[PDB]
Design a protein around this ligand. Structure first.
Ligand SMILES: [Mg+2]
Ligand SMILES: [Mn+2]
Ligand SMILES: [Mn+2]
Length: 341
């Protein structure tokens, strides 16, 4: 039932999906990156680099994206949510006490902003707010229209953006089996922070990731860490990503009831395989599915998935603390300070 890696699935992806969503389908012109390249058992998403020059360049890449978009209009399995290309430099801060001020005029909610101006490495929640504003995320209709309106009413055109950039990102969601899966395609048409243990509070599961990088060239330890992260706790991570998929699709304004329901159904089934979960959250989700309807249901679910998200994090971090302490103690105290760069 669950979406697990198999070669039947990989072949289906490479044969039936990729030729449809890639700018250049030729196998020699694309590379699979990230977790899918490692063929992790609990598939989360697919990351791909598409090197399309000289086949495609500044002068014809737009029309090829238009072709892709149009080919999907009547395809219920594939949706191109965002085309990411360009930046809005007005949100290019210099992180100076005076920089910030000059941007508030174009923000709506700077309470959240001032509610975390408190206090040098917390630029993380600053960029966490303005990232979507700095990086231009084009919708399909904005791409087809060929123009985009920015905050404050500033006008921008897609052709200008491609001419001033070397790469664009296609953000797809694809219904592979029972629910949507993210496909991120980095399209190159012209010729990191989460690795520091210092930037973590006590998210012990995610703090294993810097450790895995540290021990990447140690066979015995890298196998153990890979097993722990990807198999023992693999489903915890997959469920977090799957909840992010709901959120992302919903926030973009493209989640219909049928898709929301398929996601919620898959989560209810799989959540029972986990340990330490407040199953009351699950019961609350079922009661929504019973006494709400249409959009109100989608919204109520979104709200409840947020609690569930928190709960899953809490649980996996708790069950992970010992594996962290174990492997961190393998590193010398002098070096364990600034793991791992
Ligand atoms: Mg579609
Ligand atoms: Mn990935
Ligand atoms: Mn991705």
């Amino acid at each position: 039932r669950m979406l697990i890696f198999t070669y039947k699935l990989e072949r289906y992806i490479k044969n039936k999906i990729l030729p449809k969503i890639l700018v250049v389908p030729d196998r020699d012109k694309y590379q699979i990156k990230g977790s899918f390249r490692r063929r992790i058992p609990y598939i989360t998403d697919i990351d791909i680099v598409n090197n399309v020059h000289p086949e495609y360049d500044d002068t014809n890449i737009y029309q090829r994206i238009v072709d892709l978009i149009n080919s999907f209009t009547n395809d219920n399995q594939i949706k191109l949510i965002y085309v990411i290309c360009g930046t809005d430099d007005r949100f290019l801060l210099t992180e100076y006490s005076d920089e910030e001020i000059e941007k508030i005029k174009i923000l709506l909610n700077p309470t959240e902003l001032v509610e975390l101006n408190n206090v040098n490495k917390k630029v993380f929640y600053i960029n966490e707010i303005i990232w979507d504003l700095y990086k231009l995320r084009w919708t399909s209709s904005e791409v087809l229209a060929g123009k985009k309106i920015l905050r404050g009413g500033i006008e921008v055109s897609f052709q200008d953006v491609v001419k001033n950039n070397s790469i664009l990102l296609l953000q797809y969601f694809v219904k592979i089996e029972y629910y949507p899966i993210g496909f991120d395609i980095a399209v190159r048409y012209k010729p990191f922070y989460q690795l520091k243990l210092a930037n973590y509070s006590k998210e012990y599961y995610f703090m294993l990731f810097p450790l895995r990088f540290y021990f990447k060239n140690d066979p015995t330890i890298s196998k153990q860490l890979e097993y722990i992260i990807e198999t023992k706790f693999g489903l915890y991570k997959q469920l977090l990503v799957r909840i992010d998929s709901y959120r992302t699709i919903y926030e973009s304004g493209n989640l219909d009831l049928d898709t929301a329901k398929s996601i919620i159904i898959s989560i209810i089934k799989d959540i029972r395989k986990l340990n330490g979960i407040d199953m009351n959250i699950i019961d609350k989700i079922q009661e929504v599915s019973n006494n709400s309807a249409g959009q109100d249901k989608i919204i109520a679910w979104n709200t409840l998935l947020t609690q569930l998200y928190t709960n899953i994090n809490k649980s996996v971090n708790k069950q992970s603390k010992k594996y962290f302490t174990r492997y961190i103690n393998i590193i010398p105290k002098e070096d364990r300070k600034l793991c791992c760069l």
